[PDB]
Amino acid sequence: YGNWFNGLKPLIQNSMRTIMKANPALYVLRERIRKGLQIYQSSVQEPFLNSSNYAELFNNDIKLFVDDTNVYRVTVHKTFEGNVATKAINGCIFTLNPKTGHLFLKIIHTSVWAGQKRLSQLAKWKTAEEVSALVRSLPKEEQPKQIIVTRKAMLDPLEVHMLDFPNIAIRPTELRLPFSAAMSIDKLSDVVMKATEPQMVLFNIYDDWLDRISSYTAFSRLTLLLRALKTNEESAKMILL
């Protein structure tokens, strides 16, 4: 209630709608009220991804991977007083369709953090906000039936942001897939490094291999390369190049 000028009232409407839907402190309140009241909501829990069932990734249900590991990043230096300290650097969200090789790479710029406290929480919530906006940009036939998150800490923030989409399961995995090593890919590293503002850059990470090999084979190749890059980056690059 109060004195509106032109354009303010629609903005505050949209602002309050999203804030009430998905603010993290109001989520803590709701979860505590649920725990104190001992109320639980029924659902059909989708199974985990593992090495016994991951062949299912390449059937006709559209799927997307999500990795948050590179959303918050830092570099380290030693201060004048003898202490050691961090400084934030540009980051990203890795979102990959494993059948087609389409990578959606949302760049998370250093201006997003605004010097705030408790940034490692804010990163997980920002990740869910960008993933759910990305899903909303796609038409119904191209929206996935399942989304797989590499780190379980994403499951609550993403489920909250995805309540708009009742048909879409969010899945955990037993495989510690190496997708954090995407920032060891030279071109992606450069693209994230040079950015002066938030933007999303789109690629195919399978580089037309699908003309001569299957999606299963292409995923195996991608995971093998990224595993080596995570294992020993210098040696892996020095094999590839």
Partner 1 sequence: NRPERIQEAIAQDKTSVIIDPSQIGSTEGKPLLSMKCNLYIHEILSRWKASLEAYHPELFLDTKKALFPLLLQLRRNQLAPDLLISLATVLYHLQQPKEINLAVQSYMKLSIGDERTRLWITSIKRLITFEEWYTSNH
The residues that touch partner 1, with contacts defined as CB under 8 A, are 133-134, 137-142, 199-204
Other Cβ atoms closer than 10 A to 98: 21
Closest separation between CB of residue 78 and partner 1, Å?
Answer: 39
Closest separation between CB of residue 200 and partner 1, Å?
Answer: 5
Tokens of 136: 């909303």
Which H or E element spans position 154?
none
- Of 203 and 209, nearer to partner 1 (C-beta) is 203
Paired with 149 in beta bridges are 66
Measured on CA atoms in the order 72, 170, 177, 222, is the torsion positive or negative? negative
Tokens of 218: 């292409």
Q: Which stretches does DSSP call E strand in the chain?
A: 63-67, 73-78, 84-89, 91-96, 102-108, 146-149, 169-171, 199-204
Using the 8-state DSSP alphabet, how is residue 152 labeled?
G
**β-bridge pairing 73-78 and 84-89:** antiparallel
Which H or E element spans position 226?
helix 215-231
Closest separation between CB of residue 166 and partner 1, Å?
Answer: 18
- Of 135 and 236, nearer to partner 1 (C-beta) is 135
Closest separation between CB of residue 207 and partner 1, Å?
Answer: 12
Closest separation between CB of residue 128 and partner 1, Å?
Answer: 15
- Of 106 and 229, nearer to partner 1 (C-beta) is 106
- Of 90 and 95, nearer to partner 1 (C-beta) is 95
- Of 153 and 168, nearer to partner 1 (C-beta) is 168
